[PDB]
Amino acid sequence: YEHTAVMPNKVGIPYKALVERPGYAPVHLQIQLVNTRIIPSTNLEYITCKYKTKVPSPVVKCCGATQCTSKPHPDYQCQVFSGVYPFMYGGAYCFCDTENTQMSEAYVERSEECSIDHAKAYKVHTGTVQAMVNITYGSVSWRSADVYVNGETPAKIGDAKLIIGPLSSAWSPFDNKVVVYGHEVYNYDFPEYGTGKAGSFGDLQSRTSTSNDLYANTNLKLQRPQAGIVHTPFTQVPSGFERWKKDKGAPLNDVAPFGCSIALEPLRAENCAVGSIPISIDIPDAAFTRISETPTVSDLECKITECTYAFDFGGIATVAYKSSKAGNCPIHSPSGVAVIKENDVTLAESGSFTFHFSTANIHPAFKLQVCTSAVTCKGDCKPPKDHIVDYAAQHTESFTSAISATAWSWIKVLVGGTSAFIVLGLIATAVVALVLFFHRH
Amino acid sequence: YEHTAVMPNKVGIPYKALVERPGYAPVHLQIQLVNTRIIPSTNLEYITCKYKTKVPSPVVKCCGATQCTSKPHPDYQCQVFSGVYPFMYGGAYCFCDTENTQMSEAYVERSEECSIDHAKAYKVHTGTVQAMVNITYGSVSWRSADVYVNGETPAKIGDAKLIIGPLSSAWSPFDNKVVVYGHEVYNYDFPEYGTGKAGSFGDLQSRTSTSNDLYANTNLKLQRPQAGIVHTPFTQVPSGFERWKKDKGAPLNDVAPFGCSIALEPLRAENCAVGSIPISIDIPDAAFTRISETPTVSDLECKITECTYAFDFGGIATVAYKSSKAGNCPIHSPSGVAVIKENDVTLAESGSFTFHFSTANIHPAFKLQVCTSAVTCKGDCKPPKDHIVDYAAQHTESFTSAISATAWSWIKVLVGGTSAFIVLGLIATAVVALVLFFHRH
Amino acid sequence: TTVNFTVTGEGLEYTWGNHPPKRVWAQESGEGNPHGWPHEVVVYYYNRYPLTTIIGLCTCVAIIMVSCVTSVWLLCRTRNLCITPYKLAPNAQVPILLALLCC
Ligand SMILES: *[C@@H]1O[C@H](CO)[C@@H](O)[C@H](O)[C@H]1NC(C)=O
Ligand SMILES: *[C@@H]1O[C@H](CO)[C@@H](O)[C@H](O)[C@H]1NC(C)=O
Ligand SMILES: *[C@@H]1O[C@H](CO)[C@@H](O)[C@H](O)[C@H]1NC(C)=O
C-alpha cells in the first residue's frame, strides 16, 4: 500500500503519519532523516600553492662574454652581467678585470609543500542530493538506508520501498566557483588559468599537483651580483598564496545559511534545512491487520492536565476510554497544532491513558486519532520559563498560534464595533431617505 | 602592439586585418581557426548493456521438500515445483512418484559483451570551449597552438600573445542528458538509476562496467520444468538494450545544427559555426617598420577586369600605381564588400599589379588599402554559372548586395513619383486655402 | 531511386552509407536579368528572394494605390473648393486662368 505525503526538510525531526488502508486497521508510520547531503558536481580547474624559486649555478666566463637563451621554464629569467670580478676562497676567480662575464638564471617551480599545502580551485555545477533515512512502521523496528533524493529511484528499507521527491528548493550554498583549502570551502571567484597576477591568489597555477606545465606570474628580476661575490641575487613579489592565507577571511563552513555543514569527501553541504521533501512509501501488505481483528474504542474523553508551549514535549494529556479486546492501539494527531510523543498505547477494557505532546499554540485544539477513532483535545498552555534551549523545536508555529482568547475577543470587539457603527450610519441614511419620500408622498 | 577585433566563428575561412600602429607601416595579420571544440563537462550516471541470465543447477529433493530463500542477486527468482518425477540418462532420478520437489533458481548478470558493447549514460553540464588557431603576420610564417576560448587565458603563438574572447553564443548541441554508444551520441532522457523498465533502455543499469551492484528489472519468471526432465525453464522480457540498438534513431552526429561534428575523446562538438569570436593579439614590436622606411605608393587606379559573385575568388582586378623604393607592400580591403585573395604584392617604381577577390555584391564598390595608400575599386559582376559548389562562401552577403543599379533606379522612380503625387496634392490644397482666405479678406 | 534535397547558401551535408559526409553549398545563380526590363528584374529577384519579392511588390502596389487615391482626392477636393465660390455666383468674371489652375 503506497502512502504519499510531504515532510519538512528537517534533520532529527521525525515525520509521523497513520497509513490508512481501506478495510484494515491503520499502521503507524514514522520517517526520520538522519542527514541530508547536497553533493554538487565539481571540475578541478587548477591547483594553487606557494612557489619555489629554483636558481641554477651562474656561468662565470672569464675574459669573454656569454648570451642568454630562452627556455620553457615558468617565469624563466636570464640576464648577462658584464664587468664582474668575483672572488672566492682561492682568490680572484678571473684574470681580466672588466672583460669577464657572469650569466644568472632563475625560474619558478612548485615547492615541496605544494604536495600537501595547496588550494584546489573548483567549478561547481548542480549535482545530486542524497539522504540517510530512518524508518519504522507498525511493529517493525527502526531500519535505515542511504537513498537518492530524486523522486524516482526507489530504495528498499526493511521490505518497504521508499521514493523521496526532489527538494522543493534548488538552493545550494556553493557558488559557481569555489576554492577548497584544507577542510574549508571558500566562495572565491578565482582568476582563470593563465591570468593570475603577481602577489595574488593565482600567482602560481597548475592544472594538477603533478602537472609538468606550471604557470607562474611573479615579477622575478635578477639583480647584479655584489662586487666580488659569486651569487645569483634576485627580487620577487612575495607569494600571493601566503597573502591569501592571511586574508582568506571566513570560509563557507561558517557563513553558509540554513546551518549547512560542509564536507569535502565528496564536496557537499549537509543538513541544509531548506523547503520540504515529498515522500512515497509502500507498506508491505503483511503489515496490515483487518479492522474486525483490532480493538474498537469508544467514549473517548481527552483532558489536558498540563501544557506549556515549550520546544520540548511540555504538554501532558489524559484520555479516558473504553475498548473491547484490550489490545494495542496507535495514537496520532493529524492536525499540525500538536505533535504527539507516543506512537501507540496499550489499552485495557476500560480506564485511561496519558500521552505527551508539543504545541506552539497558546490555546491548542487538535484531533487525536486513537486507532479507528478520534477525540478532540482542548486546553490552555502556559509560557515556557527557559529563555534559551540547546534543542530544536519539536512543533511548528503558525500565524495565529500566539493569538490568545483575550486577543481574539478584542479583535472581534474592534472589528464588530466598527462594522456595526458603519452599518448604523448607512441604515440611518436609508431610513431618513424613506422618511423624506413619505414627506413628499 | 595590441590589435583588437571581432572575427566570425567560421572554420577554414581566414580573418584578415591590417595592424596599424601609429608611426609604423601597416602589418598584415591573418588569423584562421583550424577547429573549434565545445567540450562540456560530463558525469557518468550508469552503464547499460545486454543482460545475461545465470541459472544454477536446480536442487532436486527426492521424497521430501525444500524451501526457497532470498539472496542478494539482481532480479533473483526462486520457486519450488512439487510433484516432479525427473528422469536422467540412468533412469528415474527419484523414487517417490510425487513427493519430490525441484527448486529452480535464476538471476541476471552482465554479459561478457558488456565490457565492450555497452552504452554510457552521461549528465552534461556547461564545460569549456577550446580552439586551434592558425596565425601569420608580416613576414612570420604560419604558427598555431591550442587556445582557450574564454577571453581570459592568453596563448603564445609565434612570439605573439593571443587572447580569444568567449563565443558570442552560448549554444551547445548537447542536452542535459546524453547517451554515448560506440562513436555515436544520442540526446536521450534516459531513466534515472533504479527506474529503468523491463524491455526498455534502462532495463539493466550499472553505475560502472566493473561494479558489484547491478540493477536488473526484467520479468524473469521461472516456469515449471517439463514432465520428467531436469531443466530450469524461464521466461523473460527480451533485452531492452538490443531493442534500443534497433530503434536508436538518428544520432546527434547526424542532427546537430550548424554542422557540428561530434567526437568522444573527450566528448565534444567540433566546428559549430555559431556567433562570433572577439580576439585580441599583441604583435611583437619588432614586426613593425617605420613609415619613412617603407615604400610610398601614389597615383593608384583600380580597374575591375572580370567579376562574378561566385563563392570562390571569382573577381579579378588590375591596379596601376606609381611608387618609390621598390619593395613589398601589404594589400587589404577594410570593408566586407570584397575579400582579397592576395595578402601582399611587390611594387616597382612604376607599373601595375593584379589581385583576386570574392564578392557577393552585383555592383561591388570597395576600398583597397595598399600599405600607406588606398584606392576605390568599382565594377559590375556577372552571375555564377555553377548551381552547387563543394566549398563555403568566402564573402558575406548583405541586405543590399543583390540590389542592382536598375532596381535602385526603379525604387527611386517609385518613391519619387508617389511622394510627388502626394506633395502636389497637398500644395494645391494649401494654395486654394490661401486663395479662399484672401477672398474673405 | 532519385532524391531531391534543397540546398541554400548555408549549405547541406549528406552521407551516403559508409561514405564520408559530403558538404555542398548553393550559389546565387538564379535565373533572370537584374539589368533588364521590369519583368526580367522581377523574375531575377523572385527567383533569388521569392517571398521578399512578393511582399515588396504587394507593398509597392498598396503604396501606389493609397498615394494615387490620396492625390486624386486632394486634387478633386481642391477643384471643388476653388470652383464652388463661382458656381454660387453665375454673374462672375470667372477668369480663364481659374479654369486652367483649378481644373
Ligand atoms: C534509527 O532510530 C533508532 C531509534 O531512534 C536509533 O537507535 C538508530 O540508531 C537510528 N538509525 C540511525 C542510522 O541513526
Ligand atoms: C596554417 O596555415 C598554413 C597555410 O594555410 C598551413 O600550411 C598550415 O599547415 C596551417 N596550420 C595547421 C596547424 O594546419
Ligand atoms: C527532382 O527534380 C527533377 C528535376 O530537376 C525531377 O525530374 C524529379 O522528378 C525530382 N524528384 C523528386 C523526388 O522530386
Chain A hits for B194, Cβ within 8 Å: 148, 152-155
Q: Give the CA diameter of chain C.
A: 99
Q: B306 to chain A, minimum CA–CA distance in Å?
A: 49
* Alpha-carbon distances, residue A340 vs A369, B425, C84 (angstroms): 11, 91, 100
Going by C-alpha positions, the residue among A264, A247, A283, A224 that lies closest to residue A102 is A224
For an interface test with C, the pick among B412, B422, B427 (most C C-beta atoms closer than 10 Å) comes out as: B422
Is the N-terminal amide bond of C50 cis, ω within 30° of 0? no
Element containing residue B118 per DSSP (H, E): strand B118-137
The rounded Å distance from CA C4 to ligand 3 centre is 6
Distance CA B281, CA C68 (A): 59
Closest-approaching ligand to the CA atom of C2: 3
Distance CA A61, CA A65 (A): 6
Ligand 1 pocket by Cβ (under 6 Å)? A 34, 134, 142, 144
Contact indicator for A185, A262 with CB cutoff of 8 Å: yes
Distance CA C65, CA A29 (A): 81
Distance CA A350, CA A325 (A): 10
Q: How was this structure determined?
A: cryo-EM
Closest-approaching ligand to the CA atom of C3: 3
Beta partners for B200? Answer: none
Distance CA B16, CA A436 (A): 96
End-to-end CA distance of chain C: 71
Element containing residue C59 per DSSP (H, E): helix C50-87
A153 with B127: Cβ contact below 8 A: no
- Count of alpha carbons within 13 Å of A300, Cβ hemisphere only? 21
Q: Taking phi first (over 0 means left), then psi (-120 to 50 degrees means alpha), and beta for anything else, what does residue A435 get?
A: alpha
Distance CA C74, CA C77 (A): 5
Distance CA B408, CA A291 (A): 92
Could you please report the per-residue DSSP string of A190-251? Answer: PPPTT-PPTTSGGGEEESSTT-S-EEE----EEPPPPTT-----EE-PPPHHHHHHHH--S-
Burial pattern B148-174, b for ≥16 Cβ within 10 A else e, equals bbbbebbbebeebebbbbebeeeebbb
Give me B294's grid cell: 617603407
Q: Specify the long-range contacts of residues B138-145, CB closer than 8 Å, at least 24 apart.
A: B138/B27, B138/B28, B138/B283, B138/B287, B139/B287, B140/B287, B144/B34
Using CA coordinates, name the residue in chain B closest to C31: B383
Distance CA B421, CA B201 (A): 72
The rounded Å distance from CA B85 to ligand 1 centre is 50
Distance CA B106, CA B216 (A): 12
Distance CA A330, CA A138 (A): 9
For an interface test with B, the pick among A73, A75, A125, A213 (most B C-beta atoms closer than 10 Å) comes out as: A125
φ and ψ at A255, to 5 degrees? Answer: -125, -5
Distance CA C34, CA B401 (A): 12
The rounded Å distance from CA C3 to ligand 3 centre is 7
Contact indicator for B385, B405 with CB cutoff of 8 Å: no
Going by C-alpha positions, the residue among B262, B360, B173, B258 that lies closest to residue C13 is B258
- Rounded (to 5) percent helix, strand, coil in chain C: 55, 10, 40
Distance CA B103, CA C63 (A): 91
Contact indicator for A183, A119 with CB cutoff of 8 Å: no
For an interface test with C, the pick among B255, B396, B435 (most C C-beta atoms closer than 10 Å) comes out as: B435
Is ligand 2 within 6 A of the CB of residue B144?
Answer: yes
Residues of C with CB under 8 A from a CB of B: 7, 9, 11, 13, 15, 22-30, 34-36, 38, 41, 45, 48-49, 60, 63-64, 67-68, 70-75, 77-78, 81-82, 85, 102
Is ligand 2 within 6 A of the CB of residue B200?
Answer: no
User: What's the DSSP call for residue A292?
Assistant: G
Within 8 A by CB and 6+ apart from A1, the residues are A19, A21, A282, A283, A285, A288
Classify burial at C16, counting beta carbons within 10 Å of its beta carbon; exposed 0-12, middle 13-18, buried 19 or more. exposed
Q: Give the CA diameter of chain B.
A: 140
Is ligand 2 within 6 A of the CB of residue B142?
Answer: yes
Going by C-alpha positions, the residue among A318, A330, A307 that lies closest to residue A395 is A307
Give me B107's grid cell: 538471476
Going by C-alpha positions, the residue among A344, A345, A305, A333 that lies closest to residue A396 is A333
Q: Is the dihedral of CA B166, B167, B173, B175 positive or negative?
A: positive
Nearest to B429 among C22, C23, C78 (CB): C78
Using CA coordinates, name the residue in chain A closest to B40: A43
Classify burial at B24, counting beta carbons within 10 Å of its beta carbon; exposed 0-12, middle 13-18, buried 19 or more. middle
| Listed resolution, Å | 3.9
Give me B335's grid cell: 570593408
Touching, B vs A (3+ Cβ pairs under 8 A)? yes
Please identify which residue in the block is written with the cell numbers 565534444: B268
Please identify which residue in the block is written with the cell numbers 484672401: B438
Residue B383: count of CB within 10 angstroms of its CB: 18
Please identify which residue in the block is written with the cell numbers 578541478: A44
Element containing residue C72 per DSSP (H, E): helix C50-87
Chain C hits for B440, Cβ within 8 Å: none
Distance CA B30, CA B283 (A): 12
Going by C-alpha positions, the residue among A206, A180, A369, A204 that lies closest to residue A265 is A180
Distance CA A138, CA B435 (A): 106
Chain B hits for A192, Cβ within 8 Å: 148, 150, 152-153
Element containing residue A180 per DSSP (H, E): strand A177-181
Contact indicator for A174, A187 with CB cutoff of 8 Å: yes
Give me B154's grid cell: 592568453
Going by C-alpha positions, the residue among A308, B421, B34, B259 that lies closest to residue C71 is B421
Going by C-alpha positions, the residue among A396, A398, A403, A411 that lies closest to residue A381 is A403
Contact indicator for B55, B28 with CB cutoff of 8 Å: no
The rounded Å distance from CA B17 to ligand 2 centre is 18
B428 with C48: Cβ contact below 8 A: no
Contact indicator for A32, A16 with CB cutoff of 8 Å: no
A152 with B191: Cβ contact below 8 A: yes
Could you please report the per-residue DSSP string of B17-74? Answer: EEE--TTB--EEEEEEEEEEEEEEEEEEEEEEE-EEEE-PPPEEETTS-------SST
Please identify which residue in the block is written with the cell numbers 616597382: B348
Is ligand 2 within 6 A of the CB of residue B30?
Answer: no
Give me B427's grid cell: 500644395
Chain B hits for C15, Cβ within 8 Å: 254
Q: In what order do the strands lie in the sheet with A297-306?
A: A297-306, A315-323, A350-359, A338-340
Going by C-alpha positions, the residue among A194, C90, C19 that lies closest to residue B154 is A194
Q: B420 to chain C, minimum CA–CA distance in Å?
A: 9
Torsion, Cα of A333, A338, A339, A344 (10° steps): -40
Torsion, Cα of B363, B365, B370, B374 (10° steps): 150
Give me B141's grid cell: 610564417
Using CA coordinates, name the residue in chain B closest to C14: B254
Closest-approaching ligand to the CA atom of A136: 1
Contact indicator for B110, B51 with CB cutoff of 8 Å: yes
Q: A67 to chain B, minimum CA–CA distance in Å?
A: 19
Contact indicator for A160, A282 with CB cutoff of 8 Å: yes
Beta partners for A315? Answer: A357
Pairing state of beta strands B388-389 and A27-48? Answer: unpaired
Q: B173 to chain C, minimum CA–CA distance in Å?
A: 17
Distance CA B252, CA B9 (A): 21
Contact indicator for A113, A50 with CB cutoff of 8 Å: yes
Contact indicator for A225, A86 with CB cutoff of 8 Å: yes
Q: Give the three-state DSSP class for B252.
A: helix
Q: Ligand 1, residue A144: give the atom nearest the CA.
A: 13
Classify burial at C25, counting beta carbons within 10 Å of its beta carbon; exposed 0-12, middle 13-18, buried 19 or more. middle
B386 with C22: Cβ contact below 8 A: no
Q: Give the CA diameter of chain A.
A: 141
Please give the single-letter amino acid code of residue A154.
P
Touching, A vs C (3+ Cβ pairs under 8 A)? no
Within 8 A by CB and 6+ apart from A210, the residues are none
Distance CA B327, CA B222 (A): 91
